[PDB]
Write a protein that holds these residues in place. Sequence first.
Motif, mmCIF file in Angstrom:
data_model
loop_
_atom_site.group_PDB
_atom_site.id
_atom_site.type_symbol
_atom_site.label_atom_id
_atom_site.label_comp_id
_atom_site.label_asym_id
_atom_site.label_seq_id
_atom_site.Cartn_x
_atom_site.Cartn_y
_atom_site.Cartn_z
ATOM 1 N N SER B 178 -1.089 21.495 37.513
ATOM 2 C CA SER B 178 -2.414 21.631 38.108
ATOM 3 C C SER B 178 -2.787 20.389 38.901
ATOM 4 O O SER B 178 -3.935 19.932 38.864
ATOM 5 C CB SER B 178 -3.467 21.923 37.042
ATOM 6 O OG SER B 178 -3.065 23.001 36.218
ATOM 7 N N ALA B 299 -10.912 29.643 43.855
ATOM 8 C CA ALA B 299 -9.620 30.260 44.123
ATOM 9 C C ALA B 299 -8.550 29.748 43.165
ATOM 10 O O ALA B 299 -7.712 30.523 42.688
ATOM 11 C CB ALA B 299 -9.220 30.007 45.573
ATOM 12 N N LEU B 300 -8.564 28.447 42.868
ATOM 13 C CA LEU B 300 -7.601 27.886 41.928
ATOM 14 C C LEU B 300 -7.808 28.441 40.527
ATOM 15 O O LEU B 300 -6.840 28.678 39.799
ATOM 16 C CB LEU B 300 -7.698 26.362 41.921
ATOM 17 C CG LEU B 300 -6.651 25.618 42.750
ATOM 18 C CD1 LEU B 300 -5.255 26.010 42.303
ATOM 19 C CD2 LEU B 300 -6.834 25.887 44.230
ATOM 20 N N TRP B 303 -6.278 31.782 40.501
ATOM 21 C CA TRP B 303 -4.829 31.633 40.434
ATOM 22 C C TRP B 303 -4.377 31.316 39.015
ATOM 23 O O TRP B 303 -3.421 31.911 38.506
ATOM 24 C CB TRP B 303 -4.388 30.540 41.406
ATOM 25 C CG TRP B 303 -2.918 30.290 41.438
ATOM 26 C CD1 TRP B 303 -2.281 29.129 41.121
ATOM 27 C CD2 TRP B 303 -1.899 31.217 41.824
ATOM 28 N NE1 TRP B 303 -0.925 29.275 41.282
ATOM 29 C CE2 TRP B 303 -0.665 30.548 41.710
ATOM 30 C CE3 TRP B 303 -1.908 32.548 42.251
ATOM 31 C CZ2 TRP B 303 0.548 31.166 42.007
ATOM 32 C CZ3 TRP B 303 -0.705 33.158 42.544
ATOM 33 C CH2 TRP B 303 0.506 32.467 42.422
ATOM 34 N N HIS B 304 -5.075 30.400 38.348
ATOM 35 C CA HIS B 304 -4.680 29.930 37.028
ATOM 36 C C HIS B 304 -5.073 30.878 35.905
ATOM 37 O O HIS B 304 -4.613 30.685 34.776
ATOM 38 C CB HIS B 304 -5.275 28.547 36.760
ATOM 39 C CG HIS B 304 -4.425 27.422 37.262
ATOM 40 N ND1 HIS B 304 -4.385 27.053 38.589
ATOM 41 C CD2 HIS B 304 -3.577 26.588 36.614
ATOM 42 C CE1 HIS B 304 -3.552 26.038 38.736
ATOM 43 N NE2 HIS B 304 -3.049 25.737 37.553
ATOM 44 N N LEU B 307 -2.109 33.680 36.620
ATOM 45 C CA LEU B 307 -0.743 33.197 36.416
ATOM 46 C C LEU B 307 -0.194 33.436 35.015
ATOM 47 O O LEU B 307 0.947 33.917 34.904
ATOM 48 C CB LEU B 307 -0.688 31.715 36.792
ATOM 49 C CG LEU B 307 -0.276 31.440 38.233
ATOM 50 C CD1 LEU B 307 0.150 30.028 38.336
ATOM 51 C CD2 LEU B 307 0.873 32.334 38.631
ATOM 52 N N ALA I 20 -6.785 28.001 52.757
ATOM 53 C CA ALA I 20 -6.012 27.779 51.538
ATOM 54 C C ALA I 20 -6.613 28.540 50.363
ATOM 55 O O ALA I 20 -5.892 29.212 49.608
ATOM 56 C CB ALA I 20 -5.936 26.285 51.228
ATOM 57 N N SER I 21 -7.936 28.458 50.202
ATOM 58 C CA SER I 21 -8.601 29.162 49.114
ATOM 59 C C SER I 21 -8.444 30.668 49.259
ATOM 60 O O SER I 21 -8.106 31.360 48.293
ATOM 61 C CB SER I 21 -10.079 28.781 49.071
ATOM 62 O OG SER I 21 -10.645 28.813 50.369
ATOM 63 N N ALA I 23 -6.149 32.376 50.872
ATOM 64 C CA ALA I 23 -4.765 32.730 50.613
ATOM 65 C C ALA I 23 -4.528 32.794 49.115
ATOM 66 O O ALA I 23 -4.335 33.887 48.574
ATOM 67 C CB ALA I 23 -3.813 31.729 51.268
ATOM 68 N N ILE I 24 -4.633 31.649 48.431
ATOM 69 C CA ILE I 24 -4.260 31.602 47.018
ATOM 70 C C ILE I 24 -5.062 32.616 46.209
ATOM 71 O O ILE I 24 -4.545 33.231 45.268
ATOM 72 C CB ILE I 24 -4.403 30.169 46.466
ATOM 73 C CG1 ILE I 24 -3.702 30.047 45.111
ATOM 74 C CG2 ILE I 24 -5.852 29.752 46.376
ATOM 75 C CD1 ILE I 24 -3.249 28.644 44.780
ATOM 76 N N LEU I 27 -3.437 36.107 46.907
ATOM 77 C CA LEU I 27 -2.347 36.223 45.951
ATOM 78 C C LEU I 27 -2.854 36.534 44.537
ATOM 79 O O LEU I 27 -2.391 37.509 43.922
ATOM 80 C CB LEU I 27 -1.429 34.985 45.971
ATOM 81 C CG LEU I 27 -0.682 34.410 47.199
ATOM 82 C CD1 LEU I 27 0.082 35.533 47.925
ATOM 83 C CD2 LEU I 27 -1.445 33.567 48.168
ATOM 84 N N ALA I 28 -3.877 35.816 44.057
ATOM 85 C CA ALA I 28 -4.270 35.940 42.654
ATOM 86 C C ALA I 28 -4.540 37.380 42.229
ATOM 87 O O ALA I 28 -4.344 37.706 41.053
ATOM 88 C CB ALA I 28 -5.503 35.085 42.370
#
Lengths: 99, 318, 40, 171, 115, 347, 175, 96, 83, 98
Positions: B178, B299-300, B303-304, B307, I20-21, I23-24, I27-28
């Motif tokens: 991370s 967004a992260l 993603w996390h 994942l 970037a946000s 995109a990711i 994907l998520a």
Amino acid sequence: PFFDVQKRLGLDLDRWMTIQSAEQPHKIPGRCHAFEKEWIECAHGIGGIRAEKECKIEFDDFVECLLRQKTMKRLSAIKRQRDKLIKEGKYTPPPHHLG
Amino acid sequence: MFMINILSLIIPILLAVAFLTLVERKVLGYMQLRKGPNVVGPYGLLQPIADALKLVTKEPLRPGTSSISMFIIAPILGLSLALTMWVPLPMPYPLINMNLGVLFMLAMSSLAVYSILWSGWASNSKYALIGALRAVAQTISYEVTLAIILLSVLLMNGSYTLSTLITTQEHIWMIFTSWPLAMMWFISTLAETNRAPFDLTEGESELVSGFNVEYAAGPFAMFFMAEYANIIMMNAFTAILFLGASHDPHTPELYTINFVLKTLALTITFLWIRASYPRFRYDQLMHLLWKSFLPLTLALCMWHISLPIMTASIPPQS
Amino acid sequence: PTKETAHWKPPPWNDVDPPKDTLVSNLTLNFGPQHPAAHG
Amino acid sequence: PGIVELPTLEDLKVQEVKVSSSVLKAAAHHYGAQCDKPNKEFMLCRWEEKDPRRCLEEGKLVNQCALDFFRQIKRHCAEPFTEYWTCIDYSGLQLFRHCRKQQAKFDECVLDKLGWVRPDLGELSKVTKVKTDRPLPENPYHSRARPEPNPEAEGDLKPAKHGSRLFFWTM
Amino acid sequence: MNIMLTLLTNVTLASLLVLIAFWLPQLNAYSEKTSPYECGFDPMGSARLPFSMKFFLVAITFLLFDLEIALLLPLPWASQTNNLKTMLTMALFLLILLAASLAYEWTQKGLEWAE
Amino acid sequence: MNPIIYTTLIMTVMSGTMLVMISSHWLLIWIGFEMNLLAMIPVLMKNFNPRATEAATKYFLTQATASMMLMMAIIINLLYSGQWTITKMFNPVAMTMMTMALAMKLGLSPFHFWVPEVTQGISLQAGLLLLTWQKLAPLSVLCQISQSINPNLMLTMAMLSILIGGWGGLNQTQLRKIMAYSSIAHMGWMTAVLPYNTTMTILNLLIYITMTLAMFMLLIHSSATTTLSLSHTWNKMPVITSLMMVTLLSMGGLPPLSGFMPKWMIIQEMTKNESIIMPTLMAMTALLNLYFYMRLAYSSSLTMFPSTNNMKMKWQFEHTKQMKLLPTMIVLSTLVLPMTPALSSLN
Amino acid sequence: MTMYIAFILSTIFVIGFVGFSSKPSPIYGGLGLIVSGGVGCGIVLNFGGSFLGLMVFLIYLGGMLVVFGYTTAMATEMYPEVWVSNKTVFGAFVSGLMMEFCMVYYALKEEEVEIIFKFNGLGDWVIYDTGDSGFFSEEAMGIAALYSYGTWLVIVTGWSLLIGVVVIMEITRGN
Amino acid sequence: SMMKWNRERRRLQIEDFEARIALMPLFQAEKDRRVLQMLRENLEEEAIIMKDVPDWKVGESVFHTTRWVTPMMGELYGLRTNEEILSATYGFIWYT
Amino acid sequence: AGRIASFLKNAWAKEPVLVASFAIGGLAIILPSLSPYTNYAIRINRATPYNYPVPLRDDGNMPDVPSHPQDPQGPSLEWLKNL
Amino acid sequence: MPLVYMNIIMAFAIALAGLLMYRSHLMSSLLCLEGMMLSLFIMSTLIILNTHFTLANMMPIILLVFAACEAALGLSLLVMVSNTYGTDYVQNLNLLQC
Ligand SMILES: COC1=C(OC)C(=O)C(C/C=C(\C)CC/C=C(/C)CC/C=C(/C)CC/C=C(\C)CC/C=C(/C)CC/C=C(\C)CC/C=C(\C)CC/C=C(\C)CC/C=C(/C)CCC=C(C)C)=C(C)C1=O
């Protein structure tokens, strides 16, 4: 409900949580699962103004399981008499009550 | 001996904060070609003692246009929360094994606003009333990003038990998984502690100090103690959260040494950043997080959370 | 109306009252005078 | 409304197996694999009868069987068990991870001396079955007679007599 | 007990520091010290007037986002569920709603610190 | 107000009400209530005048307090029965608490001083919204809990509702205010028969609803807020003012108009159940409604009122906003008495 | 004796509420609410509600922060009120102290206080339940079930928060 | 790395749990006996307590159902020492 | 074609954080459905026995249910060991 | 019903008094209003933790999420009366009279 779309169009929307004998996460039963199972299966397809009197003893047993009003009152009476006679000094609690 | 362990927690943190006021004046000076304090004892080791004695025996002026109740309570809140927020930290054996230690400490991290607001308003000065709202907005607007970052990082740990975090890292440093997140988290930490790049509350042109203006001597020094205790506490938080270490149960001292080294390195990075960068502007300060940091953090986090599911690698709950 | 109804002025036709005392202000700042962030 | 059924103080008197949590967690899989039957039937009684007053004998059986198991492991390799349970005790979570060495040193003994095998992962987790000669708990909740249903109604809809019958409306 | 003992120790320790701070030093207590301060002057007739402001909107959208942060907090426990597909879709809904609220805040001035 | 934003406020208000009349979990009922509260405050602030801010503030305070007492009743019957299902209450004070909590949202008892004021504050379209749609949810909750409501409580509360509804409107010239007082009277009217049989309060709700749209659409087709302003409209829109008069006749319940049918039905079922004193009180007090109804009629159509010189160029311009459903809206609110048996459809 | 703490945690909750509702200076009502919430977090916590207690801690000590945020912005004045300014606030405060004091005195003497409902003065430690939890906290697992069984709840909430940011936009827009 | 280590941690958790299932029956079998011992001790002692009271039917059950319920913890740790009840209720919460 | 690519390039330059946000995030959502291991995660979650597997009363004719906790037949998680 | 229930119910009753009996302040009144929901939040958590109502464990935060929203607009309304009128003192709050 007024317009019960839940059983008409065929899905649960809120009925999952309404009562505590439903399928709880990882089968964690409620405190009064047995009593409310008894109450619910007692009063099913009977009519509220008719079921409230046939399923009475189940209902107050359920309410006393929830609140423990009667049981805690009984405990309070026991503690009252115990402290009264201990202050006026007749017997001593057995060693299981001390250590 | 529990209270002895408590005291062995508070008092050394107090000496750590005390000598941080020396290491910053030495590190900054050496970063800007200054020898730093080396006159009070050997290599300036005794200098924090002298300034502390001066500030204790400096006159604490009562703000005439103030209600003393908050003028005294605000240092109490700021200092006591800062120290009790060290309680659940995973030293090799953490002092208090609170099952929700990370959430516990994140919740207490929001309480610094409850010293800032009373300091800024009770002291009753223009600089104070401005800086109170400005700093409050800063810290509250970065607390959210801290929250989503904590959640997204923890989604791979397993729970809110902050002792098992070590068990999460063990093999590899968590930053390796991370680093985009930590890069935000660290910076938001820099924002929450009101440091030179993100301080915005001192602003020694239009806010001068912002909150610690009318505070003098002791209550004034108490807010510094809170501020430079949050430095160490959040650098230690980041250290364990991302910069993992080894811990053999038969040798507790090893993880202790590794962790304190990590904390010192991160605090040195704090001083490093402040000694170089200019200071944000309130406009840009909130532009940095609302326009830029928050969408990336959202967004992260997405993603996390996705994942572990796709990798079939959900962390153990217990 | 009986008595106090006399002091019950009818509302305007727009339904917006005449804008009250001008509170428009820009909160004068002296920004000094010591203020060492000006070369003193 | 009823009084009690509490069995006598002599009834709930069993030798309480007095060992430590580390020892118990060290035995664990072997203990379960070699003592499942009394345990399985005991808590089958517990879940079926919903009534520990009916399952004291099952409790005595499981206690005595576990005690026998502990006696046999005492009769044989105990120093590997001693080291194993001490090492597990040193863990603050009783973690099996930092004991593997002594784990082998334990698992071999009960393998080559008492003919036991360490259960595989999930092996001692699937739900089993067991025969109990006790009768079925026909009324586990001791429920009373269920209330009778509403009177069932049937019959084709003949047209309402004289229409709406509301005030002067003919139909 | 334990935890409460630590909180008690910390609050009493802090109060001793403030007591020594406010009592130990000696002050002549002369009147003109009480005059307030602003970079050399005093804050004229202000520092308590109602604060005509604009970032009130940022302050309130903080709270509105904080509710949703509270809503998404149970996630680490929630990931330990049997029906992972529904949890995935619905958590993703929650973060998408976070982003949509932020976007509406964005385009409609909103999070843009009012002028 | 962005058109799309206004639409999304429409449907979140309507969905908040829908959640109320379709949910079974009590918490969901509360959620719908505040969804509607949170959604209707901005539309009341569409005009953005200080009167609108006043009305919105009073609405917010009253309804927020009412919803909090709603959760109090919620928590109490949960505590005493552990059942979130909406049914007969198992604790009396919880029932009473919910009764006043809903009533404050309805404006029935002394918890009715908000509605005339808030109606004065907002625009007439927001008035239509407030006095038509924001009743369906509390009525639906009251219908679902009719098994155990203290009949004394509901009856007296409806009695004050109709009584101060009639009396308050006498000394009011603002059409919004007299409409609010009339709505309070109709609130008492349906809530009086609420405990006895909910089909009739549903019918009276329907009739009051259709009459209220048929009313408000005529107002903002005439664009009048004061009695004198409406009186000036006797000229430009003679047909609109004649229909004004006919629906103002349907107001009180003069036969054979529609408004008589709910009164007749409510009184007949009240008498079926030995309540003979009770119906006579509203039967008399409806004349209080008919009084300012007749005053409005006299100012509107029956007597010509002095127009204005400038007003004549209004003759050159036509109402462009169609404001659909008005014809059938009038018609259903005027001639449905020969269709009284259709009430059995609701049952 | 720290036996009665689970009682007193509620008791300090009550009299911290009264001063909070004693209609003092807005920040002093805020202080009353703050001490009330801090002591009520203990009330939920010692009942086992660790997550809910820390949750209300976090969100509520942000929520009173924001209601402060306008107290110094849209609620202060030339002379802010003081917790001793008005004379009636002392009467409200003392009327706050003596009512629950008399009632608890009765509950300590008769244990059958007749106020509103039925209540017993025999502490609170009884009402807990014996049992176990295995290796999962019931509170955390229940609040985690929001994403598996809370089908409608999260949907309706998230929709409401979206509508909430919309209305917050619209009412404060200032034309 | 986290994928593989987390899979191993899941393996460790299922192992630890399997130990928990292995040992659950013994803990249950000691717990019901212990709780029944508390109940019987309280019943015999309270019987001597209640001999003098004119109207107190000894050992009565407030519940009309004959089905056994889990003892409410109050009567469990009743006349017992204050430290015992303090631990039994607030130990897990107060433990660190 | 050209407009879409140019707009992507400008976004990658003008607001790089936004792309970037987005995109990711994009994907998520779309990977978990595509990924072939989410079912294995469901197997992970169902594998863990938080509660006791209460046995069934034996009466004959359940060959599927093992008679003993060491019996070969019954549910197995060797895939868990290999994973 | 033990003393904890009395205390939080009684706290709610005085919150009802404090908010509903206005003294002179709108901000402090809505402050009392949000304290009201705090009392109800604690009260609700009590039974829910007590009775092992595992699902209902999520009701408090749900109950929380909406309630702050009310305050989210309440104080939001407070500024809108404040910029024009000047204060939150509800005695000038009289323009809407007839
Ligand atoms: C031409 O144009 C120009 C301008 O504009 C137009 C300008 O603007 C300026 C103005 C610019 C300047 C003044 C430049 C300043 C430059 C310097 C070199 C001076 C500053 C030097 C530094 C290294 C910076 C230091 C600042 C830091 C780190 C942070 C700043 C912010 C703060 C809030 C700090 C303010 C000060 C405080 C709080 C006082 C410090 C107090 C303490 C250290 C207290 C310590 C207490 C303890 C240790 C307690 C514990 C004690 C003990 C003994 C522990 C043991 C005890 C127990 C009980 C256990 C100029 C000159 C100019 O030319």
